[PDB]
């Protein structure tokens, strides 16, 4: 909308290190950002591109889940939602869901059902308090899917880290329930948490994301990969994230 809606310009008041992950990105274009809790420092590949704001797509379901927990639309004893009986192209969508199943399978109707129960003034208050990208709700429909709401790769890390780590009005059990829903991988060395996001425009991928965090025995790292061209899917952004986190020593 405004002159500032496509770009995040706020200086990092933080130690930062510039990375060169161009070989892993290959023919794809985009950025990678990681923050380390113990180091209090940002590691950035393609810093200019990390500040360009893009639709978050399904990565915003992180925030819809938090808001649905905070408003008690879903809880710990019940996060179940019955299927309304409409046929979707994937059978994982064609049944009852809980937060865990819906997050894992990016089941759109679950999160759309949550968003419809949340009043616009709450969301606006939340995006303001969280500094969530351009904060632009537009028509307030599926405003996070190739629509008015945009956020940069750098802000994806900053905002997620601050939401989880600051003592805010989001309770600790809601944060824990969100985390369980986002867990992808756990072994002796680490726990990897995250959420893909994929934008499709005219049958073509236009926008790929993977936003999350890693807990090791020694540190906690928030990260995000955004793809803007080449093959910009969430699945590709996830693959790129894993190669970079592994090269950086985060996964061992």
**Cα angle 169, 170, 171; round to 5:** 105
- Show which residues are catalytic: 58
DSSP 109-153: HHHHHHHHHS-HHHHHHHHHHHT-TT---TTSSSTTSSSS--EEH
Beta-sheet strands, E only, within 29-148: 29-36, 41-45, 53-54
Residues composing the chain: 252
Beta strands 190-201 and 183-186, pairing class: antiparallel
Contacts for 190 with CB less than 8 Å, ≥ 6 apart: 214, 215, 216, 250, 251, 252
Beta-sheet strands, E only, within 130-240: 151-152, 183-186, 190-201, 204-216, 220-229
Q: Give the helix ranges, DSSP H, for 166-233.
A: 172-182
Integer Cα distance of 111 and 58 in angstroms: 9
Experimental method: X-ray
Q: How is the chain split into domains, by residue range?
A: 1-252
DSSP 8-state symbol, 230: S
Q: In sequence order, what are the beta bridge partners of 195?
A: 211
Integer Cα distance of 226 and 168 in angstroms: 27
Taking alpha carbons only, the member of 62, 94, 53 closest to residue 212 is 62
Residue tagged 């500040």 (tokens): 51
CATH 3.40.710.10 fits 1-252, yes or no: yes
Decide: residue 47, CB within 10 A, 0-12 exposed, 13-18 middle, 19+ buried: middle
């Amino acid at each position: 909308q405004s002159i500032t809606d496509y770009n995040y310009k706020k200086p990092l008041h933080n130690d930062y290190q510039i990375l060169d992950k161009s070989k892993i990105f290959g023919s794809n274009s985009g950025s990678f950002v990681m923050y380390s809790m113990a180091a209090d420092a940002y590691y950035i590949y393609n810093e200019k591109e990390s500040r360009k704001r893009y639709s978050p797509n399904s990565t915003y379901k992180i925030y819809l889940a938090m808001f649905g927990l905070d408003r008690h639309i879903i809880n710990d004893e019940n996060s179940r939602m019955s299927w309304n009986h409409k046929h979707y192209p994937f059978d994982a969508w064609n049944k009852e869901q809980d937060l865990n199943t819906a997050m894992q399978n990016s089941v759109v109707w679950y999160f759309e059902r949550i968003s419809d129960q949340i009043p616009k003034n709450y969301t606006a208050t939340q995006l303001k308090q969280l500094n969530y990208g351009n904060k632009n709700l537009g028509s307030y429909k599926s405003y996070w899917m190739e629509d008015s709401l945009k956020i940069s790769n750098l802000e994806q890390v900053i905002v997620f880290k601050n939401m989880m780590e600051q003592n805010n009005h989001f309770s600790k059990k809601a944060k824990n329930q969100l985390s369980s829903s986002l867990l992808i991988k756990k072994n002796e060395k680490y726990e990897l948490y995250g959420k893909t996001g994929t934008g499709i425009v005219n049958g073509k991928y236009n926008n790929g994301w993977f936003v999350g965090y890693v807990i090791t025995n020694h540190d906690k790292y928030y990260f995000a990969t955004h793809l803007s061209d080449g093959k910009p899917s969430g699945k590709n952004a996830e693959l790129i994230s894993e190669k970079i986190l592994k090269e950086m020593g985060v996964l061992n």
